[PDB]
Amino acid sequence: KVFGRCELAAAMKRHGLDNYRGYSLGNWVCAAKFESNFNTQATNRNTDGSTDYGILQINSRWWCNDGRTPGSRNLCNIPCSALLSSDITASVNCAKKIVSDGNGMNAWVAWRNRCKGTDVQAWIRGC
Ligand SMILES: [Cl-]
Ligand code: NA
């Protein structure tokens, strides 16, 4: 599915992402907008052979097993296919692991380049 902004904010809140590890909800909405355009089926192939999956574009080099990323790890203990459903639970639970791993939300390329250092609370305005 492709979420609307406030619909996704509400779903992320129901999944406990709001203020997770101190990151307010707007951070997560901004990250999803710029990673995937709020699209649970988004995929992106990288020139290192890894792929980014799902609404938070979680990458197969470290976080999920797709069977095709040489020498990679699977720290979320899931197949990457689980990140390509319309239910965001697997993405949220893996994001919670990622964000607790030692670099916070800096693991997300789109967040660190396009969200961090902006007024991210604006992403939940009107919701
Ligand atoms: Cl604004
Ligand atoms: Na992997």
Which pair of tokens denotes residue 52? 């980014």
* Terminal alpha carbon distance of the chain: 19
Ligand 1 center to 120 CA (angstroms): 8
Per-residue CA distances from 94 to 17, 21, 72, 97, 122 (Å): 11, 14, 16, 5, 25
Catalytic pick among 7, 35, 87, 119: 35
Q: What resolution in Å is listed for this PDB structure?
A: 1.1
CA atoms of 66 and 59, how far apart (whole Å): 10
Whether 35 is a known active-site residue: answer yes
Amino acid, res. 46? N
Amino acid, res. 116? K
- Ligand nearest the Cα of residue 122 is 1
Experimental method: X-ray
**Which residue ranges form the domains of the chain, and what is each CATH number?**
5-124 (1.10.530.10)
Ligand 2 center to 61 CA (angstroms): 5
Whose CA is closest to 95, among 7, 35, 47, 48?
Answer: 35
What residues are designated binding site for substrate? 101
Whether 52 is a known active-site residue: answer yes
Query: How crowded is residue 121: how many other Cβ atoms within 10 Å of its Cβ?
Result: 13
Ligand 2 center to 75 CA (angstroms): 8
CA atoms of 51 and 39, how far apart (whole Å): 15
Catalytic pick among 7, 18, 48, 52: 52
CA atoms of 127 and 120, how far apart (whole Å): 13
